[PDB]
Design a protein around this nucleic acid. Structure first.
Ligand SMILES: [Cl-]
Ligand code: NA
Ligand code: NA
Length: 314
DNA sequence: CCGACAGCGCATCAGC
DNA sequence: GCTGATGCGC
DNA sequence: GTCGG
């Protein structure tokens, strides 16, 4: 219906984020692109789109130019600009943000090949990002996600049967494909080397292949199913305290729209929902001590809601 | 008119 | 050497 | 860039 418009807005969004370094303009374009994508009519004018929440004067004007000419002069110029397009492209490498991309392009390093012959200028993360550039941009079919879950749940329980691990994100919502694997981890001995032992076992059975970052609570790395040959995949593992675990599962399961609606409804019922804890608000707005949570349902019961299945959380 | 627009873990830099 | 800021991803 | 106090 409006794919030409949403691609335009998405392309504008990236350039604001990657080149202009205007993160708020980036989100504004994405928000507009998103609301337009859910609009069930073929937009005929900018004024029509202006009615939608997140679409203001400037975007309405851009849509008018797009509907009348089939293009955007501003975009056409940006696409042909060597500096801007190179900066924009380099940010696709995990570990290279707008700042690093700008530095590289300043030094004549503009392509994937330029990065390869300039390894000395790349940090550890960026080298991993360069190494698996293609693989990281691939989606992960649910069948592989299931096999990945099998390995993670098996090895985690092997380290200690008292661990609790949940694969969250879109996979838990029942998506047929995922961008990465997000694992939440907890243990009864952890409340408000547990993570290391789990990471160590997973790289012992050669599931985890690389490490982007690793601390006491958060691991970010690369993994691969055993074998053609499966592409390397992004995997994160978070160690969360037991009393904050199910607030974490709720949050990291999503979706974003669902979390917003649930947080808003929580306010009207007199509660505030964090990624960590759920707390009651006093008459003056003073938040009290965190409420005891032992499951996802408890959060819904606190704010008088029927437990929503992850499958229905859009 | 003009401030909010999420916030945090980890890696690594800038200053001392 | 340490502390705080910055970049990055999410 | 858009919304809203
Ligand atoms: Cl809190
Ligand atoms: Na609007
Ligand atoms: Na990047």
């Amino acid at each position: 219906l409006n794919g030409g418009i949403t691609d335009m807005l998405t392309e504008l969004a990236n350039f604001e984020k990657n080149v202009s370094q205007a993160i708020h303009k980036y989100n504004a374009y994405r928000k507009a692109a998103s609301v337009i994508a859910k609009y069930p009519h073929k937009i005929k004018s900018g004024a029509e789109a202006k009615k939608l929440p997140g679409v203001g004067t400037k975007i309405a004007e851009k849509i008018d130019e797009f509907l009348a000419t089939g293009k955007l002069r501003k975009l056409e110029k940006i696409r042909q600009d060597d500096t801007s397009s190179s900066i924009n492209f380099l940010t696709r490498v995990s570990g290279i943000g707008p700042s690093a991309a700008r530095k590289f392009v300043d030094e004549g390093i503009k392509t994937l090949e330029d990065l390869r012959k300039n390894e000395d200028k790349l940090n550890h993360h960026q080298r991993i990002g360069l190494k698996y550039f293609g693989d990281f941009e691939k989606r992960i079919p649910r069948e592989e996600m299931l096999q990945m879950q099998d390995i993670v749940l098996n090895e985690v329980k092997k380290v200690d049967s008292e661990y609790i691990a949940t694969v969250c994100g879109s996979f838990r919502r029942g998506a047929e494909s995922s961008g990465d694997m997000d694992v939440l981890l907890t243990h009864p001995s952890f409340t408000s080397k547990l993570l290391h032992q789990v990471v160590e076992q997973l790289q012992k059975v050669h599931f985890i292949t690389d490490t982007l970052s690793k601390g006491e609570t958060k691991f970010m790395g690369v993994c691969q199913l055993p074998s053609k040959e499966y592409p390397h995949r992004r995997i994160d593992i978070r160690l969360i305290p037991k009393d904050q675990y199910y607030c974490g599962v709720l949050y990291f399961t999503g979706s974003d729209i669902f979390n917003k609606n649930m947080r808003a409804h929580a306010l009207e019922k007199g509660f505030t929902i964090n990624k960590y804890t759920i707390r009651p608000l006093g008459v003056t707005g003073v938040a009290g001590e965190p409420l005891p949570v032992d499951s996802e349902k408890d959060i819904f019961d606190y704010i008088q809601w029927k437990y929503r299945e992850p499958k229905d959380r859009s």
